[PDB]
Nucleic acid binder design. Structure first.
Lengths: 96, 72, 83, 109, 98, 97, 111, 99, 80
DNA sequence: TCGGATGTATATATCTGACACGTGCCTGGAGACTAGGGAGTAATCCCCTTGGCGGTTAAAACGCGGGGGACAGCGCGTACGTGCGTTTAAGCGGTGCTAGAGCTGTCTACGACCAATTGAGCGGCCTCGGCACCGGGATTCTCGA
DNA sequence: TCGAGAATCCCGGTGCCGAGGCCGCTCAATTGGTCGTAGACAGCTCTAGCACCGCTTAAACGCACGTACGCGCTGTCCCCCGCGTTTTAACCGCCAAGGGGATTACTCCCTAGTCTCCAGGCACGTGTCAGATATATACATCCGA
C-alpha cells in the first residue's frame, strides 16, 4: 500500500551544499526551488542542443553541441567557467 | 450549346444548354439526366460560384465549357 | 452556487499596501478601479489557459501543475510549486 | 568472474548522476542517438551553477545570523548579482519579496 | 495639543515596513471567491486544489507589484509625486500589452 | 551539372490564391514570405502538440493533441473557425475510403 | 491481382495542401515516437485556412491600390489592420514592409 | 522678399513623404563597413554574403523606428514636443532592455 | 577606424521622421549611435558563434536569421 | 538652535514542530559481447567573393537670420493624509461525508515495417505583358495684407 | 477676411525584364500484407475537497480637519529650423583572380541492443534543538518653542 517512487535532486543538492558550507542547513521550500531551477536549466540546454544538431543535418548530439549551446545560453563569465569545468570533467573521465 | 459538367467521381456529363439558360435550368437538366437534386448541386466555372438567378452567359459559360460539380 | 460581485472584495487598503511595497508615496483617488480591471483581465487569461489544460486530460479538478504550465506558457514561469 | 562496479560519476569525479542524465537524454526525444560525452558535460555544468548559487545564498543567510536557508536568502543572492539576475530575468520566486530601494526625490528635504 | 505627524512620514514608514517583509497582502477568502466566480464562466461544477489558488495569488501579487513600480517611475518622470491613471496606461502601452 | 532539389509550399499557395481571387498575380518576395509564415506556424503547432503529449505520459500524437494545441495558440475567432475546418476535413477523410 | 489506380490522400479529404508531405515531416521531426493517422489532415486544413485568410485580405488591399500583383507592402497593410492577425504576428518583422500612416493629434497645426 | 515657410510645415511634409514609402534610409557602404569593423573583433579573416548584410540592415532599421515611436510617446506624455535623451533612457528602462 | 561616424545626422533625422517625430534635440545622435552599436554587437556575436560551430569561414544569411530568432525578433522573407 | 514623546532595536526564558538520520529492499544501473550504419577523410569542380579604376551627380557639410518653445517664478484652492470611534467578517478549531483521483487486468484494434511501381513535383527555356519612367498640365495647399 | 507662389496628382506615351507556362524525368508517396503492443474499458480503494457551526478580535468603514501640491498664467532668452553655397564620396559599370563551398567515394569504429547481476536511492519512522513568542528595557528619531 506504499506510494510510487518520485525521483528528485535533493541528495545531490545537499551534498554540494555540505561541500561548500559545512555548517549550514536548508529548508524544504528552498530545496523545491533549487529542484525547479535545475530542471529548467537542463531543459533549456537540451532543447538548444537538439535544435543545433538538427540545423546541421546530423543525427546525434555530442560534447561539441553541448559546449556550443552552453556558450550561446549563458553570459560571459559563467560561460567561460562552465566551459572550463566541462572540458576538465570530460578529459578526466576519458583518461581513466 | 453543349457544356461539360464533371462530377465528384470523375464522370463528365453533356448538357445541351444555351448561354441565356439560367443555372437553375442547368440544375434541372442535370437532375433529369442523372438524378442529382438541384439543391445538392454545387457548381464552379472560371472560379465563380454559379447562382440559379444568373444565366450561363453571365458566367461566360459557352459551348464545350468545363464545369465542376460537388454533391456534398 | 452561483456567486455575484466578488471583485469588490479587493479592498482599498489592500491596493494601498501593494502600492506601498511597490514604492509609491502618494496615491490618487481613481487608481483602484483601473487596478481592479487590470487584475481581472490577467486572471481571466490565466484561468482560461489552466481550464483548457485540465480539460484535455479528461479530469474535473484543477491541479497546481496546470496553473504552473499555463503561467510558463506566457513567459512568466514560477518556481517553488513542482515541475 | 566479474569485477566490482564503479559509478561513472566516481570516474568523472563529480557529485551529480551521469547515468540518470544519460537516461533522461535518451528518453527525452531530443535526437536519434546520444553520444558518450554529453552527460558528463551536462552534469559538470549543472554542478557548477548549483554550487555558485548555493554559496551566494549561504553567505546571504549567514549575514543575517541564521543557520538555515529560506527562500528570501535565495532571492537576495540572485537579485544582488549581475549575471545571475540576467539569467533569471523572467522568473518569480515564491515567498521572495523585493529589494529595499527608494527613489531619491521622495526623500524628505 | 495632540501629537500629529506631518504628511508623508507615515507613508515612508509603511514603505520600509512592507519592503522588509515577505508575507502576502491580499486576504485569502475574497481572492478564492473571485477565482471561483471567474472560472465559473468557462465550465460549471469545477473543483480546485488549494495549492493552485496559492500559486495564482503569488503570481498576481508579483505582477501587480511590478506594474506599480513602473507606474511610479512614469509618474516621477513628469515632475510629479502623485500617481495617476494615465501613468498606468502609458506603462501598459509601452510594455507591449493591449 | 548536378542540382539538389529544394522543397517549398509555392504551388499550394498559388492554388489557394487562384481559388480565392481568380485574377491576381504574386511576386517572388511575397511567395518567400508566405513560405516562411507557413513553416513558422507548422513548427509552433507541432512543438506545442509534442509537449502536450509528453505531459500526459503518452507516446502517440493524434488529432486531439492537434485540436488542443490549436485552441491554445490561436485566439478566439480564429480558433473557432480553424477547429470547425479541421473537424470537417477529418470527418470527410474518414467517411470516404 | 490488379492494383487500383492511385489516389492522393489530399484528394479524399478535399484539401489542397499535401497530406503525405506533412505526415513525413511529422514523422521525421522528432516530435513523438509514433504519429496517428489523423493529425496530418487536421494540420493541413488549419494551414490552408490561415493561408486563405491572409491571401484574401492581401488581395483586397492590392485591388484597392489599382494593382494586379501582391507585393510585401500589401501583405503588411493587410496584417497590421486586423487586430486578430496583428495579435498573432506580434513579434515578427516583415522585410520591405513599412509602417501605418498615423500622426499624433497634438502635433497638428493650430487653426 | 523670398518666400519662406513657417517652422514646422516642412517637418510634417517630410513625415508624410517618408512614412508613405518603403525604402531604406541609410547608405549601404558605411553600414557594410561598420558591420565588418564590429565583426572583426570576434574572429579574424571573415567573409560575408550580401544577403546577410541586407538582413542586418533591415532588422536594425526596424528596431530604431520602433524605439523612436516609443520615445515620441514618452516625450508627449510630459507636455513637450521635442524628444530628449532622458526619454530614450526611460523607454529603454521600461522596455526591460537596459538593466 | 571611427566608422561609427558613417551614420550621418540626416540619416538619423530621416529615421526619426519616419517614426513620427517633429522636433529633435541636439544630443539624440550620440544615444542613437550607442544603442545601434550595442544591438549590432549582440546580433553579430550570436551569428559568428553559429558560423564557428558550423565549421566554415564565411557567414551565411541563414545563421543571421537564426540569431535573430533566438532573441525573439523573428524575420520573414530571407530564406527562413 | 533644544527637549518631550513615540516607535524601533536589543536582551532573555521557553516550548514546539520540522530537520536530520537509521533501515529494508527492490528496481534501475553496470559489466561483457555483437553487428551495422553514421561520420571522418581525401580528391575534385567551379561559383561566388574580393579587389581595382573612372565619372557623374546627388547628397553631405557649413553659415546665418529669427521666431517659437523650454523653463523659472507666482498664486490659489482643492483633494488627500492622519487620527478616532464604530461595525463587520475573516480566521481558527472541530465534525461529517462522499465524489473522484489513482492503481490493476485484459484484450483488441491500430501503427510500424517491407517490396513493387507509377504519377506528382522540380529544374531548364522562353515569351510577352504589367509596371517603371519621362513630359505636361490641373489641382490643392500655405503665407502676407 | 482675400490672392500669389510652390508642391502634388492625373494623364499619355514608351520600353524592359521577370512571371506565368510548357517538357522531361527521377525519386517519393501508394498499395497490399504481417505482426506486436498502447491504450481503452471495467473494477476497486482510499483521500481530500466541500459544507456547517461556533467564537474571538483584528481589520475595514465613515467622518472631521488642515495643508501642501497640482495647475493655470506670465515673462525671458536661446537654440533648432528653413534656406543658400560649396565640397565629396556613393554608385554604377567594367574587368581579373582565386579561395572556399558543395559533391562523391571509401573505410574504421562508436553506439544500440541483449542478458545477468547487485547495490544505491526512496518510503518509513523517530528524537531533539533552531527558532518563533512573549516580556521587559534601552536607544534613535521627529516636531514644536
Amino acid at each position: 500500500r506504499r506510494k510510487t517512487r518520485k525521483e528528485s535532486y535533493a541528495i545531490y543538492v545537499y551534498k554540494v551544499l555540505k561541500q561548500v558550507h559545512p555548517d549550514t542547513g536548508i529548508s524544504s521550500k528552498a530545496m523545491s526551488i533549487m529542484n525547479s531551477f535545475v530542471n529548467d536549466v537542463f531543459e533549456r540546454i537540451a532543447g538548444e542542443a537538439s535544435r543545433l544538431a538538427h540545423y546541421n543535418k546530423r543525427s546525434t548530439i555530442t560534447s561539441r553541441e553541448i559546449q556550443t549551446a552552453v556558450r550561446l545560453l549563458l553570459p560571459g563569465e559563467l560561460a567561460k567557467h562552465a566551459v572550463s569545468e566541462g572540458t576538465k570533467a570530460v578529459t578526466c573521465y576519458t583518461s581513466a | 450549346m453543349q457544356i461539360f459538367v464533371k462530377t465528384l467521381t470523375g464522370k463528365t456529363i453533356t448538357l445541351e444548354v444555351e448561354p441565356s439558360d439560367t443555372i437553375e435550368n442547368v440544375k434541372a437538366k442535370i437532375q433529369d439526366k442523372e438524378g442529382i437534386p438541384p439543391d445538392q448541386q454545387r457548381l464552379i466555372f472560371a472560379g465563380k460560384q454559379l447562382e440559379d438567378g444568373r444565366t450561363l452567359s453571365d458566367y461566360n459559360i459557352q459551348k464545350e465549357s468545363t464545369l465542376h460539380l460537388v454533391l456534398r | 452556487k452561483v456567486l455575484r460581485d466578488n471583485i469588490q472584495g479587493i479592498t482599498k487598503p489592500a491596493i494601498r499596501r501593494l502600492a506601498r511595497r511597490g514604492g509609491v508615496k502618494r496615491i490618487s483617488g481613481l487608481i483602484y478601479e483601473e487596478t481592479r480591471g487590470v487584475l481581472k483581465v490577467f486572471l481571466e487569461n490565466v484561468i482560461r489557459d489552466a481550464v483548457t489544460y485540465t480539460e484535455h486530460a479528461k479530469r474535473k479538478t484543477v491541479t497546481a501543475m496546470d496553473v504552473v504550465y499555463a503561467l510558463k506558457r506566457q513567459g512568466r514561469t514560477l518556481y517553488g510549486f513542482g515541475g | 568472474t566479474r569485477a566490482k562496479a564503479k559509478t561513472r560519476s566516481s570516474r568523472a569525479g563529480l557529485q551529480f548522476p551521469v547515468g540518470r542524465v544519460h537516461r533522461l537524454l535518451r528518453k527525452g526525444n531530443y535526437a536519434e542517438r546520444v553520444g558518450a560525452g554529453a552527460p558528463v558535460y551536462l552534469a559538470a555544468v549543472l554542478e557548477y551553477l548549483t554550487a555558485e548559487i548555493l554559496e551566494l545564498a549561504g553567505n546571504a543567510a549567514r549575514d543575517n545570523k541564521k543557520t538555515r536557508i529560506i527562500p528570501r536568502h535565495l532571492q537576495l543572492a540572485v537579485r544582488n548579482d549581475e549575471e545571475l539576475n540576467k539569467l533569471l530575468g523572467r522568473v518569480t520566486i515564491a515567498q521572495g519579496g523585493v529589494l529595499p530601494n527608494i527613489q531619491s526625490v521622495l526623500l524628505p528635504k | 495639543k495632540p501629537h500629529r505627524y506631518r504628511p508623508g512620514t507615515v507613508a515612508l514608514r509603511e514603505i520600509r515596513r512592507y519592503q522588509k517583509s515577505t508575507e502576502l497582502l491580499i486576504r485569502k477568502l475574497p481572492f478564492q471567491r473571485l477565482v471561483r466566480e471567474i472560472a465559473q464562466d468557462f465550465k460549471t461544477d469545477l473543483r480546485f486544489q488549494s495549492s493552485a489558488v496559492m500559486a495564482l495569488q503569488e503570481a498576481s501579487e508579483a505582477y501587480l507589484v511590478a506594474l506599480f513600480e513602473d507606474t511610479n517611475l512614469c509618474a516621477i518622470h513628469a515632475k510629479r509625486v502623485t500617481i495617476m491613471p494615465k501613468d498606468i496606461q502609458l506603462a501598459r502601452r509601452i510594455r507591449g500589452e493591449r
